[PDB]
């Protein structure tokens, strides 16, 4: 009943109980059940989408709402990446020149050819 996908099935039942679904993980685990691990009692009706609400379904997190958690996750990524990118601007310059190598950058040692020295060849 509660979610959009359980509602969408409402035309698809005729004479099947319209069960309001509750995630089995959120049932209090100190009550007693015929199957304690699944937190189910015998002959208990199943929602049409029961496979998405039983104990083997993906875990549900209660502390935050899903929307707010999305806000926090996007915000963390945004602030981290934006801060790093901005920091790239305010950077000191190095003090030593990048090193160099004999034979025009050892272009022969890294394969290379007379006719093709830009492809293979170091800073020389």
């Amino acid at each position: 009943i509660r979610a959009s996908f359980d509602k969408a099935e409402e035309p698809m039942l005729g004479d099947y109980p319209d069960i309001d679904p509750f995630p089995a993980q959120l049932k209090n685990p100190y009550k007693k059940y015929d199957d304690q691990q699944d937190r189910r009692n015998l002959e208990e009706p199943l929602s049409v989408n029961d496979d998405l609400y039983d104990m083997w379904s993906p875990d549900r997190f209660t502390h935050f709402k899903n929307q707010d958690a999305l806000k926090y996750f996007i915000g963390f990524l945004t602030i981290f990446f934006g801060a790093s990118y901005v920091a790239t601007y305010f950077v000191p310059e190095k003090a030593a020149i990048p090193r160099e190598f004999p034979y025009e950058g050892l272009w022969k040692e890294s394969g290379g050819t007379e006719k093709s020295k830009a492809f293979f060849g170091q800073r020389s």
């Binding site: 006719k115 093709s116 492809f119």
Partner: protein, 83 residues
């Protein structure tokens, strides 16, 4: 500690706290088979062992590169980046 368990349930792994009464004799058999297997494997795979370097001579390597150059000159083959 421990608890009851069904005795009819036969598992290749032994089940619950499997500690057979004749385990020392069975262990002697198992270690003998282990030693035999390891030594057979170590000896049989010996001919397929080799070192990585110094197995082909400079003559072969140099002449193979020369022949490949010959092949690439018979065809029209420029080098990478050579344009």
């Amino acid at each position: 500690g421990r608890y009851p368990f069904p005795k009819d349930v036969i598992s290749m792994t032994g089940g619950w706290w499997a500690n057979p009464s004749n385990w020392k004799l069975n262990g002697l058999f198992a270690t003998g088979i282990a030693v035999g297997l390891a030594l057979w494997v170590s000896t049989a795979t010996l001919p397929y062992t080799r070192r990585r370097e110094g197995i082909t001579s400079e003559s072969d390597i140099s002449k193979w590169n020369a022949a490949a150059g010959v092949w690439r000159e018979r065809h029209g083959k420029i080098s990478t980046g050579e344009a």
